[model samples]
Target chain A: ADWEDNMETLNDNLKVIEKADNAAQVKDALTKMRAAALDAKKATPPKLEDKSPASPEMIDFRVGFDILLWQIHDALCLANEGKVKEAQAAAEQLKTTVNAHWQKYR
Target chain B: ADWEDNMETLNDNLKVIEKADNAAQVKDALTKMRAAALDAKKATPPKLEDKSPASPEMIDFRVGFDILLWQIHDALCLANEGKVKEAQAAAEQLKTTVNAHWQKYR
Candidate 1:
């Protein structure tokens, strides 16, 4: 449950970054999202009654969250540099990558 | 010019839908996105000085916006039905497709 909750927080932050209109907002959202991703990474995996590791879904979510965080960070940096069109293009790619991972594993 | 404006409007609306937390907000955003997509589709393609048709980029943008509108509509419907997880998956797909198209053609 803790892992899931962390993922949810990370997901919400990702959405916030995606909708941000300016570089400052993007930077702010990215900071929060990065924290959430780190928390999610530190969360202990769920264990089965027999002590087996959690399902692959948990690992996939963590990987996806980290990838998305890096991608959005790049996009935000571009926006902060005054590259509006390029930043938008990068941001679009971030959204696409995150969504593709979600559809495949979430 | 009109086509570009319409695409921008549609893109903004899609972002709004992606960030929406509630079904009602998603529904409202979808309504605006649908209308923007329709407007974009009806826009006249740009004419080159040689009288050739608009570049493939324009066509791709129109197609992508229309696809995103429909995908977000599906996601919003799922949210309305309380299937939050499924709705999010669908929404993620929408973001991915739109971004891929942007990266490829825009």
Candidate 2:
């Protein structure tokens, strides 16, 4: 139940990010998403096998996700400071990263 | 020059978040300290006061300096979201809004 709840929250936060037009909206959504991700991480079961193939991939995905979050945060901060061009550049980088990860993993 | 090089890269990303210990080194020193606060808000200079007062108080100091960036982003977004937290809780709102108005009147 808790895992499901966290997943739902993460989905909802993603929606918020999708609709965000400005820094403030993006930041709020990202923070909530981070919290949800943290909760989900806590709920994960520990691996018992030493050669689990899925573990490395999952770890990579997690690290990628964290990097994505930081990029978005940077973009939002740039936007807030009125660096629209730089912000847009950061946003573009973020989209590229997201797309690459999605194509590779999803 | 160039606003003291964006205030010395925002004081060297606040000393790399006072030597961050986790969260990817406080999210890569908050994305290079938000690109040095957007280059010191584009080298501010036109502010003429009259509506100023050094702006509001600032968010809770407990979240630490790096978290301050997120909290400020939160408080800013809350406004865009058309919701406002209590003044005390909001930690003096944002300095940009005040400075923005100052620029308008300057």
Candidate 3:
């Protein structure tokens, strides 16, 4: 019951954030998501299906981190080439990539 | 005007997400944040201040990624120890960390 309630609340929050228009708003929404996740942890421990024996979240994060790493590298390259705007753009895109990945799970 | 508008929309989204009660909603909000960030990038490239010449977003992401990496390592260790529940918990926490870092900007 606690798990369902928490999950429901998280779903509702996602609905609200779908309308965000800027990065700042996304930040706030992310923070809220973190807090809610903590709440869920407190309400009930997440179940780990022993049969699967794999951490889906961890695997996803590993892949996501790799993508971010490459973006960071590209951003550095652009910055070095005097393409400051493009470098900045790449950085911004990286941030967006990170945000999108995290949001998909919550 | 575009920047302001984008910022305003992001801010509004944050407001809605602040009341989020679950992780799922947070995830949704994060997705919206990412989409808005992409929109912003499309409008005009991001500016990079030459004096500092460092990618703030990239740096933050690097550190954040490091944290996630460690968390993953820890989760793996826990799982190996037959602490499946705790392993999952660590993975979940790592996800929150990733989300929080991304959301701080948009």
Candidate 4:
């Protein structure tokens, strides 16, 4: 239930991150989305039904989250440095991470 | 900055809680908002600038968070019990709490 809820907010923020009019807006959305993703760490993806939190599959899932979170942090750092183009590119990389995990577990 | 970010997510979830189509949706939003509110416990509200975390005002601010969190829990309990109308009323009560604090420290 929580994973489903978290994913809804994650997707909502992803849309804003993708379509935002300004860099600040994108950064803000990314931050909120990161919170949603982090909160989901306590939850089990419905597709990964009955998997233990320490299961190999679950570990891999959290590893995916690490990449996603690190990229978000990287994007924020680039934006903070005023590397607008680089930050935007970093933001776009989230889609690949998101989709890869979605294909497997979402 | 973290406090600001946490409040942004809290407010977003509050909006969803108030406007969700079903009790399940409302409960979900409340849970997310509670997480955001809890996260903000580590953050200092900007308007309370320079107050020590242990200062009365700062402690009061956290108490406010406690109250807000409690109400959210109550609303979730109500929703879980299938008391749809009562839960909605509790959701509406958050506006008063929000506005009262906003006048002081938003």
Candidate 5:
């Protein structure tokens, strides 16, 4: 449920980010989204259920989480600097990364 | 869980509708979404806790469900005729009906 709920949170937060009109609102949602990514990282993904945490698949999955976390942080900073367009661009870039990881790991 | 899962199903099917490229695909999703709407209708909404099914709130909520079901049926017909644009327009029309109901009952 941890993974499922966090994934839901991640999804909802992204929606909030998409609609948020200001940097502060974007930051609020991204903060939760980053935390959700980390929470989802703590659970063994369903696709890698039998693998050890240190196994290649699990390791790679964790790397994907880190990438998502880092991307959220990147957007967070852009928002903080009041660069709304760049922050939104960061979100667009993150979508490609997110889809790749979901296709391979989730 | 019934309420929660059905709500999730409803949300997922809408996403499918949004991305579906053709009427056939849209029909497939709307069928599932229509079922979810009915399933959700059977449960007492959270906002009407302790209220009788015969109460004004419950009655009104069911009306909302019926309205959504009708809207889905309306779109289903459009898709059946291979009118993809009209089917999508039906979905847009549904949004207003859906939002009004949610604001009042959900």
Candidate 6:
């Protein structure tokens, strides 16, 4: 859960940075998110708890967000590689996949 | 605040649905996100509170999320409309814009 907390913190920082009016404030927020994202990616997942049924659901949510986070990471990586169009296409593909999964299950 | 609350609730519901084991759950989540997205877009912005300095930051955060949420909505809408490329491009552009803004302030 530490990893998830890190990501959540990063996301929250992104929100904070987005609202920053000055460049300095914005940069700080971005830096936080970038660093937090890396930290989150590296942090070990918390040991699974067997105490409650709800615990698994927490893990499930964590895994699900982790998958989405990786997808976002890949897209950002592609963009950083100067393959902006490719990155965009990748995101599109992900959206399609999400949609398809939803449709199939719905 | 009410509108934001609604969006937050919807986002939470999406997480719940994502964890659902069956197709029915996934479908329900997809449906919910779609509906919630629309509902959020239609909802009016909450009145700004002036009692505390921190209140503005909260409002700022809400607006920031609102913009990101709309971007996500656009991406999803584009995917639904079969303009997957466009949708992804939009998301990418938004990310880039976000990145640039942060850099300038940082």
Model 5 TM-score on chain A:
0.90
lDDT by residue for model 1 over A8-51, one digit each (tens)? Answer: 66567667766767767665665565555454443444431132
Q: Give the TM-score ranking, best first.
A: 5, 4, 1, 2, 3, 6
**What's each prediction's TM-score?**
0.38, 0.35, 0.26, 0.47, 0.48, 0.26
The deviation in Å at residue B91 for candidate 1 is 2.2
Estimate every model's Cα lDDT from 0 to 1.
Answer: 0.58, 0.47, 0.45, 0.71, 0.73, 0.46
DockQ of each: 0.01, 0.03, 0.02, 0.01, 0.01, 0.02
How do the residues B2-103 of candidate 3 rate in per-residue lDDT, one tens digit apiece? 433544444444444455555455445444544444444333213322322223333333344344443444455455555555655654675566457446
Q: Candidate 2 on B1-106: residue-level lDDT in tens?
A: 3534644554554455445444454445445545554444434333322222222111111112233355445543443443433212343432333333233433
TM-scores of the candidates, chain A only: 0.57, 0.53, 0.44, 0.85, 0.90, 0.42
- TM-score of model 3 (first chain only): 0.44
Clashing pairs in 4: none
Residue B94 error, candidate 1, Å: 1.4
Give a tens-digit lDDT track for model 6, residues A10-98: 55654554344444454344345444543443333444333332344433533554465566556555544555456546556555543
Against the true structure, whose lDDT is highest? 5
TM-scores computed on chain B for all candidates: 0.62, 0.25, 0.45, 0.85, 0.84, 0.42
Off by over 4 Å in 1: A1-106, B44-66
Q: Report how far residue A48 has shifted in candidate 5, in Å.
A: 1.2
Provide the lowest-lDDT 10-residue window in model 2 chain B: B54-63
The digit string of per-residue lDDT tens for model 1 on B10-75 reads 567667766767777766766665676677655654442233122333433444554465465556
Q: Give the CAPRI class of candidate 5.
A: incorrect
Better-scoring candidate (lDDT), 5 or 6:
5
Q: Docking quality tier of candidate 1?
A: incorrect
Runs with alpha carbons beyond 4 Å of true place in candidate 3: A1-53, B1-106
